[PDB]
Design a binder for these strands. Structure first.
Lengths: 217, 456
DNA sequence: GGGGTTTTGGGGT
DNA sequence: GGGGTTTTGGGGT
DNA sequence: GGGGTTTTGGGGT
């Protein structure tokens, strides 16, 4: 029924629309009011159910540092922020190194403008969990890959190259190597499957440590 | 020399270190609280403190440490723990034993059953019935006079678990009432299925006495003892209100999944009473996209106890690993990406036993006996990220996998009924989140499905 | 006082 | 600090 | 020496 998690609904709709942010429902592109769980070494904000990592543009922090002098970003822990201008992108990453991702895919929250509300902002919430560790969400991403994988395999594998029945039915005096059952899924370059059709968004962003040196060298 | 005292007889006044043996009936996983501290909380029992006048009574044990490795991991309820130097104090009416492992306190775990959980998983025998399977510090010493204390407590541990539920109705919440809790709760259920979601996570399919089915993520490394058909107690779960497609439980770093020792009366009754449910699967087959995994097949009873082998091992290591080379029959799980030949009508070919050749039923044969010659292109958790898809065969000319489709081989160009049932099975097998549990036999470098059949 | 360690008598709390 | 909330690791903590 | 504990300066190993 109704999805309580703003983030989960947003990120799920993005993946269910091949990473196209223009195909995601317009009634969901309203300002995001979220609680800041951590600010360093990782900046993580919650929507009351999950936590995701926002990716700030150089423009976003400079604008911030102007309209709100001396109010450091890396010290926003336990305070709220309102993201007025933001976009969602899909990026290929190394899930073994990035914890805010799954199956080498990440949905990024690109922040263009955000204002802090220190006004004793509250809200009794459940413990926030990594959206990329959620059962249903992991499943949504698996669906995404399964669709890309199946489309690539039905395009790549043709001609019904079936193992000759004699090779198996009359296997006495016949030895074989199992790697004969290995079939390439797509026209890739390396050992990883990368035949996707969503155009990987680019957009430059700041490393959380640069915003820490900019405020406290 | 250590003097062991019984739980109810331990002194509340003399804040001096005391020692005791006891049976563990519940425990959190060891968890971190800040930067230099780890805690493990457990409920203990013995002949002098095991039952309120019906619901189970117990003392509590809180172990403090500076390292994760210095705290006990309780995978099973019913085993025994021996603690040295605990201080006892009353905490909200209950007798609470506190022990700082980081200072001078220590613990040792003893198996009530023949083997410990870990020994069962790795099929090892126990060194002896007086050996601790886990303990704190570099050493553990058990004196001759402790042997009787241990053997007697084991005897008692079994009597206790076989005649009482131990984990009484007040220590958990019915799954169909889970959504009504304000915070976390405990659950006692049967594992109906263990699905390998990915390289690090299992997804458990649970069902309790109330009949509700729930799913929950279970890390492979943390809970390596989960097994289908077994009953467990989940210590600390919360209801996930963000899961719309399926009922999900969220566990925390302090949560724990606990099994029961063989003599457990509760585990035995729940194992028999709670029967398999496929309602979640049948309902999901009506949807275009199912966030619920559906295991479409069932292996023959004689293989139910055979361990599974990943596709990674099956196709990339089977000709190099000593253990995999000596075997020719395996059990594995996977999802089908494509089925060849494309035309469902050509799945059944005519086979000539003498020339060892098969042919299409074009001008409809006599060319040979009808057989299935199907080639599945599969993939699994262990190969999720690579650019490969693997060939798994269903070549039934010698009888292997003849009943896989619950449709005896026939000319699919003429038998509309057979063709339709196979076409429907084809869509089901290639559908996202559909998986196959199968036993395969290795012949001339290929794997042929055998002793496996569809259940949908 | 007592562990393990080596400090083999002596800080700080 | 115990019926709880880390990050030596953010997929045992 | 240094923790944790309290022994709050000093044992044994």
């Amino acid at each position: 029924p109704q999805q309580q998690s703003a983030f989960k609904q947003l990120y799920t709709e993005l993946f269910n629309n091949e990473g196209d942010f223009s195909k995601v429902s317009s009634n969901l592109k309203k300002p995001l009011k979220c609680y800041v769980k951590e600010s360093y070494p990782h900046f993580l904000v919650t929507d009351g159910y999950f936590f995701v990592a926002p990716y700030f543009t150089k423009e976003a922090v400079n604008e911030f540092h102007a309209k709100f002098p001396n109010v450091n970003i890396v010290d926003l822990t336990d305070k709220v922020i309102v993201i007025n201008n933001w976009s969602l992108e899909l990026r290929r990453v190394n899930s073994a190194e990035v914890f805010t991702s799954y199956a080498n895919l990440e949905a990024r929250l690109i922040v263009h403008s955000f204002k802090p509300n220190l006004q004793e902002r509250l809200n009794p919430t459940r413990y926030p969990v990594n959206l990329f560790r959620d059962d249903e969400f992991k499943t949504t991403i698996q669906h995404f890959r399964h669709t890309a994988l199946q489309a690539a395999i039905n395009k790549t594998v043709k001609g019904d190259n079936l193992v000759d029945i004699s090779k198996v039915a009359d296997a006495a005096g016949k030895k074989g190597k199992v790697d004969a059952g290995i079939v390439k899924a797509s026209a890739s370059k390396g050992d990883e499957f990368s035949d996707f059709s969503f155009k990987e968004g680019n957009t430059a962003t700041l490393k959380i440590a640069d915003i820490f040196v900019q405020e406290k060298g | 020399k250590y003097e062991y005292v019984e739980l109810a007889k331990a002194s509340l006044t003399s804040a001096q270190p005391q020692h005791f043996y006891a049976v563990v009936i519940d425990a959190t996983f060891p968890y971190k609280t800040n930067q230099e501290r780890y805690i493990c909380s457990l409920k203990i029992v013995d002949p002098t403190l095991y039952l309120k006048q019906d619901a189970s009574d117990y003392a509590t044990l809180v172990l403090y440490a500076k390292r994760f490795e210095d705290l006990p991991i309780i995978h099973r309820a019913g085993d025994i723990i021996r603690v040295h130097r605990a201080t006892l104090r009353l905490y909200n009416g209950q007798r609470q034993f506190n022990a700082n492992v980081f200072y001078s306190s220590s613990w040792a775990l003893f198996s009530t059953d023949k083997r410990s959980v870990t020994q069962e998983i790795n099929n090892q025998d126990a060194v002896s019935d007086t050996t601790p399977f886990s303990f704190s510090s570099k050493h553990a010493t058990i004196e001759k006079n402790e042997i009787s204390i241990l053997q007697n407590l084991r005897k008692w541990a079994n009597q206790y678990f076989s005649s009482y539920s131990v984990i009484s109705s007040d220590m958990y919440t019915a799954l169909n009432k889970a959504q009504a809790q304000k915070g976390d709760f405990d659950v006692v259920a049967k594992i109906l299925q263990v699905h390998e979601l990915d390289e690090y996570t299992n997804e458990l399919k649970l069902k309790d006495a109330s009949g509700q089915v729930f799913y929950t993520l279970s890390l492979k490394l943390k809970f390596p003892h989960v097994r289908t058909g077994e009953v467990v107690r989940i210590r600390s779960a919360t209801y996930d209100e963000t899961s719309t497609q399926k009922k999900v439980l969220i566990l925390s770093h302090y949560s724990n999944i606990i099994t029961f020792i063989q003599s457990s009366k509760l585990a035995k009754e729940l194992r028999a009473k709670i029967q398999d449910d496929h309602s979640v699967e049948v309902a999901s087959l009506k949807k275009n996209v199912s966030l619920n995994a559906v295991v479409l097949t069932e292996v023959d009873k004689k293989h139910a106890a055979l361990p599974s082998t990943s596709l990674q091992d099956l196709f990339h290591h089977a000709d190099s690993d000593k253990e995999l080379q000596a075997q020719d029959t395996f059990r594995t799980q996977f999802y089908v990406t494509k089925i060849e030949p494309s035309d469902v009508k050509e799945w059944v070919k005519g086979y000539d036993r003498k020339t060892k050749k098969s042919s299409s039923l074009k001008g409809a044969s006599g060319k040979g006996d009808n057989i299935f010659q199907v080639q599945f292109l599969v993939k699994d958790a262990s190969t999720q990220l690579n650019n490969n898809t693997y060939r798994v065969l269903l070549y039934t000319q010698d009888g292997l996998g003849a009943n896989f489709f619950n449709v005896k081989a026939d000319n699919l160009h003429k038998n509309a009924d057979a063709r339709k049932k196979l076409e429907d099975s084809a869509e089901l097998l290639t559908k996202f989140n559909s998986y196959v549990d199968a036993v395969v036999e290795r012949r001339n470098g290929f794997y042929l499905i055998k002793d496996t059949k569809l259940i949908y």
